[PDB]
Amino acid sequence: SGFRKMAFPSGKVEGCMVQVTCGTTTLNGLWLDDVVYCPRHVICTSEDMLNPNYEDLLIRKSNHNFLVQAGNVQLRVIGHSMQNCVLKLKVDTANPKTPKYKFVRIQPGQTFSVLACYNGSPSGVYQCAMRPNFTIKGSFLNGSCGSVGFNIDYDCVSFCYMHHMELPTGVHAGTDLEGNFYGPFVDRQTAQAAGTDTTITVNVLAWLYAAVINGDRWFLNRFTTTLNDFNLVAMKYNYEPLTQDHVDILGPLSAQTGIAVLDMCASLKELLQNGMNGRTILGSALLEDEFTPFDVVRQCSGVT
Amino acid sequence: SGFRKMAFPSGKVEGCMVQVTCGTTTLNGLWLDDVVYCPRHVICTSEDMLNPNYEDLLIRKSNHNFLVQAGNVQLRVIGHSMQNCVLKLKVDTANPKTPKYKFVRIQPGQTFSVLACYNGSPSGVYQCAMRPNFTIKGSFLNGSCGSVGFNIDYDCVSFCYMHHMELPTGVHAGTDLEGNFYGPFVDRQTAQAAGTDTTITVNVLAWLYAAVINGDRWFLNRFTTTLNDFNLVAMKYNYEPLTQDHVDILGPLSAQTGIAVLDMCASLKELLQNGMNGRTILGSALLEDEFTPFDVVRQCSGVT
Numbered sequence: 162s163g164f165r166k167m168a169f170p171s172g173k174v175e176g177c178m179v180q181v182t183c184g185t186t187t188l189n190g191l192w193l194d195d196v197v198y199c200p201r202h203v204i205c206t207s208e209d210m211l212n213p214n215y216e217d218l219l220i221r222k223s224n225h226n227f228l229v230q231a232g233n234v235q236l237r238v239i240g241h242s243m244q245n246c247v248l249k250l251k252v253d254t255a256n257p258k259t260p261k262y263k264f265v266r267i268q269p270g271q272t273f274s275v276l277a278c279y280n281g282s283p284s285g286v287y288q289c290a291m292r293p294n295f296t297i298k299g300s301f302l303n304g305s306c307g308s309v310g311f312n313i314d315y316d317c318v319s320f321c322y323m324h325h326m327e328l329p330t331g332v333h334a335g336t337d338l339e340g341n342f343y344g345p346f347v348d349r350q351t352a353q354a355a356g357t358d359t360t361i362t363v364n365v366l367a368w369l370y371a372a373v374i375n376g377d378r379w380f381l382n383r384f385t386t387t388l389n390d391f392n393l394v395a396m397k398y399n400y401e402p403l404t405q406d407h408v409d410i411l412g413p414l415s416a417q418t419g420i421a422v423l424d425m426c427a428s429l430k431e432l433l434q435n436g437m438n439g440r441t442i443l444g445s446a447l448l449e450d451e452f453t454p455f456d457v458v459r460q461c462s463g464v465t
Numbered sequence: 466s467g468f469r470k471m472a473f474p475s476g477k478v479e480g481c482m483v484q485v486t487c488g489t490t491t492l493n494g495l496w497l498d499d500v501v502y503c504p505r506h507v508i509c510t511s512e513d514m515l516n517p518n519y520e521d522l523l524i525r526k527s528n529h530n531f532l533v534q535a536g537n538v539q540l541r542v543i544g545h546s547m548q549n550c551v552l553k554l555k556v557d558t559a560n561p562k563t564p565k566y567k568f569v570r571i572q573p574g575q576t577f578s579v580l581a582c583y584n585g586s587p588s589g590v591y592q593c594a595m596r597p598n599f600t601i602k603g604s605f606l607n608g609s610c611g612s613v614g615f616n617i618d619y620d621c622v623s624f625c626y627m628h629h630m631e632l633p634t635g636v637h638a639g640t641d642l643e644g645n646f647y648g649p650f651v652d653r654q655t656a657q658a659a660g661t662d663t664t665i666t667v668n669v670l671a672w673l674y675a676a677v678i679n680g681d682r683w684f685l686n687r688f689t690t691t692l693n694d695f696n697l698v699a700m701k702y703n704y705e706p707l708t709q710d711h712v713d714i715l716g717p718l719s720a721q722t723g724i725a726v727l728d729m730c731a732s733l734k735e736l737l738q739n740g741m742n743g744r745t746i747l748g749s750a751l752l753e754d755e756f757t758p759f760d761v762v763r764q765c766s767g768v769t
């Protein structure tokens with residue numbers, strides 16, 4: 162028993178982190194096979210970031226200008242290219258610690274682990290969710306660029322995120338491993354506001370099922386609701402509308418606990434309308450939305 | 466910017482996890498050099514756990530009865546011994562992935578990362594605090610026994626915890642790597658209640674400094690207090706008494722923010738007496754106490 166914001170073991174990703182320097186800018190790179198992936202803003206200087214022309218900037222750069230260091234040993238760069246907002250530096254050596262991997266573009270509401278890195282070195286690991294507004298509420302400082310988000314299925318690492326920037330609001334923006342930004346963000350030092358951030362309803366419901374499994378049942382009530390009634394409440398409280406797909410994914414949690422999805426929706430409805438009244442749920446005084454139904458099942462069954 | 470419950474990168478610890486089986490019981494072991502460390506209750510059966518005589522039970526066991534598997538390869542056991550509540554199985558091969566390591570007995574209020582494991586395989590990593598009552602509020606299921614807690618100083622892993630049991634209250638008890646339990650707990654299937662759990666005051670203050678650093682300042686007020694005035698409040702709210710040692714460790718955070726420790730104490734005093742009034746601090750609706758002043762400095766400076 163017990164419920165924690167758990168990250169995947171980071172070992173397979175630590176063995177891929179390298180340091181990439183170009184000119185006087187240093188950030189993190191991801192070494193998979195004979196390719197190093199990093200944010201293309203490594204070629205920029207502070208003057209360039211106001212309105213950079215990445216194509217023109219990359220033209221003034223050769224393979225020898227990109228310094229890639231893996232631990233204390235230098236990698237030899239034999240090719241370079243720009244794919245959307247990432248640079249792919251072809252090195253002459255395949256990473257011997259390359260795990261089985263995939264590049265995946267996650268959906269908003271999905272979760273992943275982040276291995277925060279500075280100068281190609283890992284400092285910490287934490288669990289995150291891609292917000293519905295495509296930002297992440299992470300923990301990143303200057304130099305953390307190139308840090309990656311991922312999921313692990315037994316031996317396969319699915320890389321889903323690469324950190325690029327922090328918005329003036331303190332939230333984080335980044336790309337998938339093909340260099341495509343999540344959301345409307347551009348890699349430019351310009352004011353970019355994130356949209357309204359909604360609460361991931363299916364995840365809050367999954368976390369309420371995790372709470373029931375682990376003994377916290379005070380919030381269960383004698384009521385039920387319908388998807389349309391529940392969604393009237395969800396809209397008022399800036400919660401994502403619940404669909405039958407969301408109900409379907411909550412099925413294993415509903416089967417294990419014996420609490421019908423719509424009944425759990427009625428508990429959530431009353432929590433939204435009445436608050437917690439000073440009480441806690443799984444050690445939290447607010448409704449947690451960064452656990453998917455898959456995360457709950459995995460943690461409550463011990464998937465390794 | 467941003468503040469997360471960050472765990473250390475788990476790679477160095479993943480390379481030490483093995484599976485230990487004795488009879489029909491399987492749990493996790495920690496392979497460092499030519500020794501495998503695991504909870505001594507691996508020699509027990511369900512009948513034995515009511516009141517086990519570990520010395521008599523271990524006498525019926527030989528080196529060949531302990532099956533140690535590292536990944537898919539078997540380790541050959543050449544020695545076995547009991548040190549307090551751990552078994553030390555001498556294997557004929559040193560772990561090639563043994564990191565630089567130490568065994569340390571942490572103090573209550575100190576934090577550490579846990580690499581939860583099942584059948585010698587890692588499933589997840591999370592940050593924990595040793596509660597003042599010597600329990601941990603972890604996330605562990607049957608089979609997680611032998612999972613370890615640790616800290617990392619650059620390349621050195623300081624192992625501080627080994628998971629042994631879950632109390633009927635759903636909280637966790639375990640030992641240091643010499644087999645000594647944290648707290649009054651015994652490795653026996655008997656009702657053992659934990660003492661009163663207090664809030665780690667120095668950690669809540671460190672987290673309030675982290676909040677100020679990251680922009681959350683609504684809780685700052687025009688008041689100050691004294692250690693004795695503050696402690697009258699701390700006692701009423703089951704907070705640990707604040708000492709000059711605690712004030713001393715908060716010094717770097719006080720210097721960085723320019724908010725005197727006693728002034729931050731006055732903010733905490735008002736938060737304890739008035740609540741949050743529906744507001745949040747670093748995305749939390751309660752006072753977080755599982756970040757030490759060292760954790761705050763490290764995360765806010767990017768120590769790798």
Ligand SMILES: O=C1N[C@H](c2cccnc2)C(=O)N1c1cccc(Cl)c1
Nearest residue numbers: 202301302303325326327348349350
């Ligand atoms: O180089 C950096 N570092 C900053 C940083 C600070 C904290 C967390 N993460 C990143 C940042 O935002 N930029 C950036 C500035 C402008 C455009 C781009 Cl792509 C990136």
Ligand SMILES: O=C1N[C@H](c2cccnc2)C(=O)N1c1cccc(Cl)c1
Nearest residue numbers: 506605606607629630631652653654
């Ligand atoms: O073998 C187990 N597994 C249980 C478990 C369940 C969930 C989390 N952690 C451990 C447990 O508590 N015991 C135990 C039972 C009695 C004495 C001892 Cl040392 C240990």
